[PDB]
Amino acid sequence: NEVGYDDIGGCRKQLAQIKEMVELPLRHPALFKAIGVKPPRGILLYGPPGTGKTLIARAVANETGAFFFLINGPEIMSKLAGESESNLRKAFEEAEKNAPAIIFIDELDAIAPKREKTHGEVERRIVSQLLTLMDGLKQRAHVIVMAATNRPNSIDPALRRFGRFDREVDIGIPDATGRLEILQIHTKNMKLADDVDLEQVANETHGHVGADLAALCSEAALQAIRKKMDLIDLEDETIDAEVMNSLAVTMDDFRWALSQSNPSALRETVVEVPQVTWEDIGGLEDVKRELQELVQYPVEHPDKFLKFGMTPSKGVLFYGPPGCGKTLLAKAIANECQANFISIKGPELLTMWFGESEANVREIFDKARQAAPCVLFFDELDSIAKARGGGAADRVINQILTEMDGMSTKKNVFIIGATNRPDIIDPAILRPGRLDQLIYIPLPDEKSRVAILKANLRKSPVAKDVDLEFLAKMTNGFSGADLTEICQRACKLAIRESIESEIRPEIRRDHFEEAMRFARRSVSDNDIRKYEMFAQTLQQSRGFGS
Amino acid sequence: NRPNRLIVDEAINEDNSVVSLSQPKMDELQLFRGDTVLLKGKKRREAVCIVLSDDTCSDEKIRMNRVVRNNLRVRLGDVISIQPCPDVKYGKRIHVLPIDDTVEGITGNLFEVYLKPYFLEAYRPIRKGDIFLVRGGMRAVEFKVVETDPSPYCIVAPDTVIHCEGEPIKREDEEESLNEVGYDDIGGCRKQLAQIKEMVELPLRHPALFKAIGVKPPRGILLYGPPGTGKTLIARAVANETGAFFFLINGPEIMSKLAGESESNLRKAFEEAEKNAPAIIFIDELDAIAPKREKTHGEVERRIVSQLLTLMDGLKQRAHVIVMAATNRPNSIDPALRRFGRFDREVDIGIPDATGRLEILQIHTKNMKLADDVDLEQVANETHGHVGADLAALCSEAALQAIRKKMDLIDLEDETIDAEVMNSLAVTMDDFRWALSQSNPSALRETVVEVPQVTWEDIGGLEDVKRELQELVQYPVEHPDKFLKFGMTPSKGVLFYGPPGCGKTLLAKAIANECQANFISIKGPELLTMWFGESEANVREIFDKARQAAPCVLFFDELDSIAKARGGGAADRVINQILTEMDGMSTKKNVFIIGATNRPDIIDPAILRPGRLDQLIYIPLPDEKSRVAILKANLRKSPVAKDVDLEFLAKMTNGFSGADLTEICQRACKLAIRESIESEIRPEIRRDHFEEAMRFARRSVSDNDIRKYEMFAQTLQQSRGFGS
Amino acid sequence: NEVGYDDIGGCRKQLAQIKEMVELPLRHPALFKAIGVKPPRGILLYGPPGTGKTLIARAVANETGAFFFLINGPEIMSKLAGESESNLRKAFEEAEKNAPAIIFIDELDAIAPKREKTHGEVERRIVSQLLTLMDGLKQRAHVIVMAATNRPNSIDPALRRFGRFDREVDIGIPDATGRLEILQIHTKNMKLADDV
Ligand SMILES: Nc1ncnc2c1ncn2[C@@H]1O[C@H](COP(=O)(O)OP(=O)(O)OP(O)(O)=S)[C@@H](O)[C@H]1O
Ligand SMILES: Nc1ncnc2c1ncn2[C@@H]1O[C@H](COP(=O)(O)OP(=O)(O)OP(O)(O)=S)[C@@H](O)[C@H]1O
Ligand SMILES: Nc1ncnc2c1ncn2[C@@H]1O[C@H](COP(=O)(O)OP(=O)(O)OP(O)(O)=S)[C@@H](O)[C@H]1O
Ligand SMILES: Nc1ncnc2c1ncn2[C@@H]1O[C@H](COP(=O)(O)OP(=O)(O)OP(O)(O)=S)[C@@H](O)[C@H]1O
Numbered sequence A: 001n002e003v004g005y006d007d008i009g010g011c012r013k014q015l016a017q018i019k020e021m022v023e024l025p026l027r028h029p030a031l032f033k034a035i036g037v038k039p040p041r042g043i044l045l046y047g048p049p050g051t052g053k054t055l056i057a058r059a060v061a062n063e064t065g066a067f068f069f070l071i072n073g074p075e076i077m078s079k080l081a082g083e084s085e086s087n088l089r090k091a092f093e094e095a096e097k098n099a100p101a102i103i104f105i106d107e108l109d110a111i112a113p114k115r116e117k118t119h120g121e122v123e124r125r126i127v128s129q130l131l132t133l134m135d136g137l138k139q140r141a142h143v144i145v146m147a148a149t150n151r152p153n154s155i156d157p158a159l160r161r162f163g164r165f166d167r168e169v170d171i172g173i174p175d176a177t178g179r180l181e182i183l184q185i186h187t188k189n190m191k192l193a194d195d196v197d198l199e200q201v202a203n204e205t206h207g208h209v210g211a212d213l214a215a216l217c218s219e220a221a222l223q224a225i226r227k228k229m230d231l232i233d234l235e236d237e238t239i240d241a242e243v244m245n246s247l248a249v250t251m252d253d254f255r256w257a258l259s260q261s262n263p264s265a266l267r268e269t270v271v272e273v274p275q276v277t278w279e280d281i282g283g284l285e286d287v288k289r290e291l292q293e294l295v296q297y298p299v300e301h302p303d304k305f306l307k308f309g310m311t312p313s314k315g316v317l318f319y320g321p322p323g324c325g326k327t328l329l330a331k332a333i334a335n336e337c338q339a340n341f342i343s344i345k346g347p348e349l350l351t352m353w354f355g356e357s358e359a360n361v362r363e364i365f366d367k368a369r370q371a372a373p374c375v376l377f378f379d380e381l382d383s384i385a386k387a388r389g390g391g392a393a394d395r396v397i398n399q400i401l402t403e404m405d406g407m408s409t410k411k412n413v414f415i416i417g418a419t420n421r422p423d424i425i426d427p428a429i430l431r432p433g434r435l436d437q438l439i440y441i442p443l444p445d446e447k448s449r450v451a452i453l454k455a456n457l458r459k460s461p462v463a464k465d466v467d468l469e470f471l472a473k474m475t476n477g478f479s480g481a482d483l484t485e486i487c488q489r490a491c492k493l494a495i496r497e498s499i500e501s502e503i504r505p506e507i508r509r510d511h512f513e514e515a516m517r518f519a520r521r522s523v524s525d526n527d528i529r530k531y532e533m534f535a536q537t538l539q540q541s542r543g544f545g546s
Numbered sequence B: 001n002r003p004n005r006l007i008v009d010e011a012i013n014e015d016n017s018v019v020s021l022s023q024p025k026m027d028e029l030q031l032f033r034g035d036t037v038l039l040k041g042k043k044r045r046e047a048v049c050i051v052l053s054d055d056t057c058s059d060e061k062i063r064m065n066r067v068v069r070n071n072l073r074v075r076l077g078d079v080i081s082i083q084p085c086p087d088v089k090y091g092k093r094i095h096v097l098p099i100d101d102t103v104e105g106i107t108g109n110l111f112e113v114y115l116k117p118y119f120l121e122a123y124r125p126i127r128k129g130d131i132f133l134v135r136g137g138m139r140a141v142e143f144k145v146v147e148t149d150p151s152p153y154c155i156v157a158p159d160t161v162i163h164c165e166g167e168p169i170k171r172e173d174e175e176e177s178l179n180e181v182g183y184d185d186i187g188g189c190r191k192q193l194a195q196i197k198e199m200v201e202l203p204l205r206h207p208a209l210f211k212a213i214g215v216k217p218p219r220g221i222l223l224y225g226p227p228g229t230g231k232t233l234i235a236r237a238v239a240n241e242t243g244a245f246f247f248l249i250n251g252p253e254i255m256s257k258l259a260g261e262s263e264s265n266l267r268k269a270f271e272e273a274e275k276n277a278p279a280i281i282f283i284d285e286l287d288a289i290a291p292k293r294e295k296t297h298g299e300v301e302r303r304i305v306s307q308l309l310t311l312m313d314g315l316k317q318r319a320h321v322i323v324m325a326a327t328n329r330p331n332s333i334d335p336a337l338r339r340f341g342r343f344d345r346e347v348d349i350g351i352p353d354a355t356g357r358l359e360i361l362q363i364h365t366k367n368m369k370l371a372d373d374v375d376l377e378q379v380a381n382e383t384h385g386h387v388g389a390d391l392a393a394l395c396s397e398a399a400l401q402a403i404r405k406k407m408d409l410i411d412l413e414d415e416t417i418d419a420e421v422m423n424s425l426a427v428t429m430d431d432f433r434w435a436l437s438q439s440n441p442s443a444l445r446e447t448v449v450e451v452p453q454v455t456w457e458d459i460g461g462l463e464d465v466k467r468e469l470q471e472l473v474q475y476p477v478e479h480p481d482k483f484l485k486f487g488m489t490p491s492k493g494v495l496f497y498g499p500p501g502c503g504k505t506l507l508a509k510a511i512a513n514e515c516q517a518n519f520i521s522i523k524g525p526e527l528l529t530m531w532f533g534e535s536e537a538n539v540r541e542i543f544d545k546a547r548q549a550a551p552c553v554l555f556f557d558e559l560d561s562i563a564k565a566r567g568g569g570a571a572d573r574v575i576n577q578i579l580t581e582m583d584g585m586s587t588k589k590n591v592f593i594i595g596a597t598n599r600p601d602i603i604d605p606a607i608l609r610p611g612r613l614d615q616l617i618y619i620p621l622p623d624e625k626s627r628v629a630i631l632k633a634n635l636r637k638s639p640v641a642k643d644v645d646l647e648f649l650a651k652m653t654n655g656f657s658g659a660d661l662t663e664i665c666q667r668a669c670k671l672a673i674r675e676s677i678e679s680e681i682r683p684e685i686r687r688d689h690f691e692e693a694m695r696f697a698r699r700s701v702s703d704n705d706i707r708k709y710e711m712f713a714q715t716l717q718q719s720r721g722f723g724s
Numbered sequence C: 001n002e003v004g005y006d007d008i009g010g011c012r013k014q015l016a017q018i019k020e021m022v023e024l025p026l027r028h029p030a031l032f033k034a035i036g037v038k039p040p041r042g043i044l045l046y047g048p049p050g051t052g053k054t055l056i057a058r059a060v061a062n063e064t065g066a067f068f069f070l071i072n073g074p075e076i077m078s079k080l081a082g083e084s085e086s087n088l089r090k091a092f093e094e095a096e097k098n099a100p101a102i103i104f105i106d107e108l109d110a111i112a113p114k115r116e117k118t119h120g121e122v123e124r125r126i127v128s129q130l131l132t133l134m135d136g137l138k139q140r141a142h143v144i145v146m147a148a149t150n151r152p153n154s155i156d157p158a159l160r161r162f163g164r165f166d167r168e169v170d171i172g173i174p175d176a177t178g179r180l181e182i183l184q185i186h187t188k189n190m191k192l193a194d195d196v
């Protein structure tokens, strides 16, 4: 019942890194003192609450068999002035006594926040006390200190110095795959109904963290118990096992718990591999190739680039009319390259307080490094352009530019930007060394339009009578988003008829013809002319605009 | 599990001697409406009652009042055996004695005021040892049946004599008080009180059961809402109804003590709760102990918050203890407390709606004799922005008024008390009207979250639009299965746009009413009011409340005001944050976002992007036919003369908006009123009034405006590219 | 020479409201203990300086004949830490002893200002101390607490909560008619010339 690596999911890579750092010196200590090389001593685990930081720490302790001394932030800070410092001192002394050992400082920020965030002489003294203890690890009795914090920015930067917490591990939020992994962990002991499909639950539970999932499963069990105990009327103090085994957890028990769920990390920026593939995108074939050359080749074939002696471009800029697949392409190329993906929409950047915005932009680029290979996507840039001509929009973009330059190409981080408005984009972004690969993405031509319709209607039951090639021929000038809306509007008609009169659930030709009568174009002819013009002259915007 | 065994449940019939079953179960046991049934509970106690039918009652459960519950030494969820009692015959003499703490203030004939009307024409079946409650004279006294001539039980027929002679008996140790708080003292928040009951009933009622399963129970529940909404009330109720030990921790009280004492008292509270588990620790005014870390400057203060956090973590012992806490400001609490393992469950006990306020008013008029002219529904409707405590106070105030004017007589009797007269005290509707004028409502500034009372009937024309709204909002709620088969996810939000005063706000509320779904309105100006720095947490708080109230329709009205304010660094941050919140809003949550603007020419294109407010619904001036419908709607409540022709009125007002017509009705109504005053007549609104009002009538939407609105109706989706 | 309602002018309506709130529980206490309905506990008088807030309190005490225990904000806050908290305790303890009684807290904002304006650990303890005492009035010992402050916004909002100072009375600036009434009060003992 004790915690182990088998109780942890959704962060394989991170859990691996920690194993490397800790396993050798903790399992083979005598070997390390003879080796003479200095190992890690301070490991900082960080991530939103409930990601399993405390869980991981304890797991590593049990699995390595090292002595585990836990230091809970709040408990330390609940003691008298001198007492907090003293308790810290003992913790380290006790660990050295029982080396090899792991000291785990939970909720580190409770003890050592930013120097400016501290109010009180006594508080500042405790931080220093901790800093000194970390330096005292020069004793090399070899105790490893792990620490957990929700917010890396809250921690006193002095702690991130060499000799202290010089190693960091980002235990971010789990992706679809991870959440599924976790769900399996907390459904180990429960009799699961056959209709249950955890993969759906995993996909559905976006913004969910480990603790949330553990709870969602817990609540799903209570639903099955409540409704099934009502009847049993057992009241017994001790319960019979045979009844518990006959107790199954239906897919409804999960859907009910799903609606009642308060996901915590929904506001958090997600870092995962997109589930969007080339197949979800119609047309733009030649662009997909160019994206593989720009993103995949430098990852899969670094040796080749070295022989020709060129450094590959850092970033790309998608530009064209709205609703043509710019967002789709960004996610798609990441999927092909099995590379992490981080989306940052314009509005997301303009939400940050003026002052706070600066540290957040850095944190984004930091996460991009952590997740290398990674494609960092700045979407909806047009929102930011409009907001400048705003001192906030200025500070953000100017810092993004600074970050781009600091980004070494060898880090395998690819930056893509997207905008529907190349006329108001900051020329600075288009400078060689930044987003200098200008890819124009126009309205879909006839052949392309057919592909889009095919993709969107895959999930839906379409009648055989429906001619999609003819639909494509009549919708010249319509964007990709326009076509999806026609399908949706046509589907609303098919659904409407299905409700009133229980009829074969399929969408037929007549629905599309009706949807077409009210269909409207999102991109006028005048817009096209302009987009076509910028397609040949966007690179000329760095001088005197026309 | 023989049929006689049944589960205890809440009561609907306020009558003490009444228990209810479902017809199918009443037939199963072979009992009927008139029958007198014998109830056997725990602790070898019994109670006798009249049985009744209840269509809502589930066959596995039995509804019984809290009085009956206590006589059986039973609580909600327990099991009891019921068996028929034809052996009950009329009584000769009955002897009941009052309980000291409920009668020490009153003197006189307790039997004529309370027992008389209580048993009159009632033929109540009672039992020896039973405790019943009689409310009257602004007081509730409980008597205990000491003896009955046909013991141990008999019916109280007119021939039965009563003797209530004797100093009130003292309270037995095991006899819990009915003056104590219970679920029946709470109204206006059924849904919330249900959620809490689910969370708490299992671990508190069946502790051994939870320890065997190994699944984690709740430990920290945080109740929040404005002051006086009944947060402290709910905590006490849940404790009593579950029979758990209740230890109250008052924030201010702890923070009034020395450093060492505060730390100490918190410890003892937890130690005491664990000692008497199962138990509920209630931390009242939590923000007093643990406010936002930035505002907690001071060493002694920082230590106590940490002290509490540690104690909360110490609950890992799993000593059947639940920690409930209340705070007016959820944002004020140190976020460390909202983390998992501590207060990981939250319940928003907001302000009561009309229906709720009525429920509450009924609670505090239990013991008062209400005159016939009293109409609590009016008072409820009238007391908008009132909170539980406000309503509770005004009822006390309306009563105190009835006493003042009736005190003329009492004074000469002051020496002693006039119990017989206390019953003669009625509370007129005037006493409420007086208290209404003197009321200081607290939650007027609070954002209201309730079901709108605006229906399709209040909206003229726009028939096809109403249709499209049902498809967008209702279908995905009522028919989720269908959407899954077609493999389409329904749109997230809508945008109303058109000339001013055509029913954009009305439609938003109407669709909410049709779906009986909660509704939250936030007008542009409201968003521009929030302090600049504060704006960030407030926008989020809105969407949080929308999630809490799912299914819910979130309506951003008067968007044009914000547009004008941007082209304003404040207006920018807000809308950009709303866009962010929209995206984070999962369509599967059944939260529908609607926006409205009179100015599609300056609306932020970002709002119109697919995935946000991508359903662009145009709402034009009403055509001839619609104008007639609107005119009827406004004049429904008013006394109109037969001569007034609305078909012609509509014909003359081509180009007028919905609001314009309403203004015409008002102006025409004002003329009729004027004439009623000058010349004393019952007013009627006739042709002459409309003609006079029409001569001065003016149109709010010009021809130039119409041309423009019609153009945007065809090109609003094109604004995401280059401007026109 | 002691103060009475006849020494007060320019606020008929307000003085009437206070009389209503106070008359029942203070004059006929036994009835209120028996009836079970809740009387007012905290009445907060507010208005610019010198409007007669302190005057009204004294008058209401005399006309009702209740025991009057005055708590001066500045006086309590001028004492050492322990004495300040202790003096508050004493005030409530004696008032409960001599019920019916009126505790008048003059210059309330001196003791309990907005939490944000309350720099200092010891100062907040006193505010909490007061809040508890007000809650301790749950004894329903025929005791009413009246308080005066120049700035209603300055008072800790916790005090305006139900069960504490749940009733407020605005004693604004007197109008022309009011000012005349006042003038007559302070010219009672003077021989006034005819030209006046
Ligand atoms: N990756 C995970 N795998 C399995 N269970 C998890 C995982 N993450 C969280 N949980 C569950 O959530 C519970 C609490 O997680 P924690 O270990 O407390 O993470 P945490 O980040 O330390 O929480 P905070 O920040 O102190 S609120 C665990 O006991 C698990 O049941
Ligand atoms: N080439 C395409 N293939 C399939 N679907 C498309 C395509 N282009 C656009 N869409 C649809 O339009 C939606 C959004 O398109 P995006 O990928 O976001 O391109 P975009 O340039 O960012 O357009 P906007 O401004 O976000 S609407 C997708 O969800 C698709 O349904
Ligand atoms: N929902 C309700 N139903 C019935 N009575 C209520 C309700 N809410 C409040 N009351 C009454 O008003 C009084 C105030 O209730 P409280 O328990 O004090 O609520 P509260 O939120 O804890 O007050 P605060 O926050 O401490 S000011 C109670 O004594 C009730 O009599
Ligand atoms: N279709 C209608 N049916 C009945 N009354 C209407 C109608 N349209 C407008 N009104 C009247 O106009 C008032 C406000 O209408 P709204 O619902 O606010 O429409 P709107 O589009 O939001 O225009 P404004 O800017 O708020 S006046 C209502 O109080 C009605 O009296």
Ligand SMILES: Nc1ncnc2c1ncn2[C@@H]1O[C@H](COP(=O)(O)OP(=O)(O)OP(O)(O)=S)[C@@H](O)[C@H]1O
Binding pocket: C007, C008, C009, C010, C011, C048, C049, C050, C051, C052, C053, C054, C055, C056, C148, C150, C182, C185
């Ligand atoms: N309404 C009034 N009627 C008669 N005399 C008044 C009135 N108002 C003020 N006065 C006189 O002016 C003096 C004002 O003193 P106070 O009663 O203390 O007023 P106050 O508002 O409490 O003063 P502050 O705010 O503490 S400086 C009184 O002593 C009276 O003599």
Ligand SMILES: [Cl-]
Binding pocket: A381, A384, A385, A397, A424, A425, A426
């Ligand atoms: Cl830009």
Ligand SMILES: [Cl-]
Binding pocket: B559, B562, B563, B575, B602, B603, B604
């Ligand atoms: Cl806008």
Ligand SMILES: [Mg+2]
Binding pocket: A053, A054, A055, A106, A107, A148
């Ligand atoms: Mg933790």
Ligand SMILES: [Mg+2]
Binding pocket: A326, A327, A328, A379
């Ligand atoms: Mg996009």
Ligand SMILES: [Mg+2]
Binding pocket: B228, B231, B232, B233, B284, B285, B326
């Ligand atoms: Mg309370």
Ligand SMILES: [Mg+2]
Binding pocket: B504, B505, B506, B557
């Ligand atoms: Mg409106």
Ligand SMILES: [Mg+2]
Binding pocket: C053, C054, C106, C107, C148
């Ligand atoms: Mg004064």
